[PDB]
């Protein structure tokens, strides 16, 4: 089974590393400098955007050394100290990036389902969350700080910057740290991001559906008022208009001015209905037609922002899953190969061939991520 696998697959690897380096580096420079221009006086999402683009900026800043690493075919020539600092720094920027993306999914979830959270105490909370995110990321990168070292490989005739696990239990430590990367670097962020997407999709879609429901009941009840001259009919139709106007009030962005004005006019028209004046209430219903027909413009604003926000959440989820999925799949079944489950030689060879491309796929997530979040 054991043969020398095709090693001519890593010829274009440093070229891709440099392409991702220049593209993602320039993009993150544009975003970070834009935050250095507009600043954003005491905001929540802008801070997370800035720190995220900073983590990605440091990651792509460390990309060129690994491009040189793949250029010399796994030969590290910079020393053990640089292997420690730049390896653990790369992992640190990765974990900080993913954790910041998850935290942004949480902040958007709270900002959508609970529009109550609109205080300036939230930035002061971020003044503790950001150091907490960096703290959890460092404590997550400690295994990449204690084992990442330079070791000599004689069969390859190459000094490689590897994870120097104890050779007695090397496979167990490898599969264990790999499982730590799978759970801490994808599973939990996929649970949080996924549940956030299901929440925003549920609340958003049901919200818009209820909005159309109420609106159509409004037009139906007004058309009923216009062609019905009875005692206990205009009152009930006005009651339906008030109830459906109160249930459709829940539309937080102007809007509250229109909905509240409508509720007030329906209320006064109901006051005229409770006295017996029907004609004046019908003229007031014509004025209601003037208000609602003069206020359909923003009703489309709600729909447009519905579509845009939906495509934004779906774009974030699909981006994260598509990008960081193959790396953690190959890391998972690779960890299965470490513990003896997968002993097929050519399969493990395929793993070792496809892992670097997946690493560049996660780095591609760090590249396009500011393009998706900032723009």
């Amino acid at each position: 089974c054991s043969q020398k696998p095709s090693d001519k697959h890593l010829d274009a690897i440093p070229i891709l590393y440099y392409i991702i380096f220049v593209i993602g580096f320039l993009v993150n420079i544009v975003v970070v400098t834009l935050f250095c221009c507009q600043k954003g006086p005491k905001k929540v999402s802008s801070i997370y955007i800035f720190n995220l683009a900073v983590a990605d900026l440091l990651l792509l800043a460390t990309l060129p050394l690994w491009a040189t690493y793949y250029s010399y075919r796994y030969d590290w020539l910079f020393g053990p100290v640089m292997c420690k600092v730049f390896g653990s720094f790369l992992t640190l920027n990765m974990f900080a990036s993913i954790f910041f993306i998850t935290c942004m999914s949480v902040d958007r979830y709270q900002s959508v389902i609970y529009p109550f959270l609109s205080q300036r105490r939230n930035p002061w909370q971020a003044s503790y969350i950001v150091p907490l995110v960096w703290c959890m990321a460092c404590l997550s990168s400690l295994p990449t700080f204690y084992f990442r070292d330079v070791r000599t490989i004689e069969y390859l005739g190459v000094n490689a910057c590897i994870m120097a696990f104890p050779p007695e239990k090397y496979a167990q430590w490898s599969a264990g740290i790999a499982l730590m990367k799978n759970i801490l670097g994808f599973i939990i962020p996929l649970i949080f991001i996924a549940t956030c997407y299901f929440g925003i999709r549920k609340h958003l879609l049901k919200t818009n559906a209820d909005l159309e429901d109420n609106w159509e009941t409004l037009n139906d009840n007004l058309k009923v008022i216009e062609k019905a001259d009875n005692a206990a009919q205009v009152k009930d139709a006005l009651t339906k208009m008030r109830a459906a106007a109160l249930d459709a009030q829940k539309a937080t962005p102007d809007f509250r001015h229109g909905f509240d004005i409508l509720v007030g006019q329906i209320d006064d028209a109901l006051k005229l209905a409770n006295e017996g004046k029907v004609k004046e209430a019908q003229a007031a219903a014509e004025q209601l037609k003037t208000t609602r027909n003069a206020y359909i413009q923003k009703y489309l604003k709600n729909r447009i922002t519905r579509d845009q926000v939906l495509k934004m959440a779906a774009a974030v989820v699909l981006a994260f899953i598509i990008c960081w999925l193959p790396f953690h799949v190959l890391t998972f079944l690779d960890a299965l190969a470490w513990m003896g489950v997968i002993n097929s030689c050519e399969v493990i060879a395929v793993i070792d061939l496809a892992l670097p491309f997946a690493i560049l796929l996660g780095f591609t997530n760090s590249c396009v991520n500011p393009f998706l979040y900032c723009f």
């Binding site: 790369l90 992992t91 990765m94 490989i153 910057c161 590897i162 994870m163 090397y170």
Partner: peptide, 8 residues
């Protein structure tokens, strides 16, 4: 033999 060489 087998060792972990990839950066991540």
């Amino acid at each position: 033999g087998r060792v972990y060489i990839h950066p991540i």
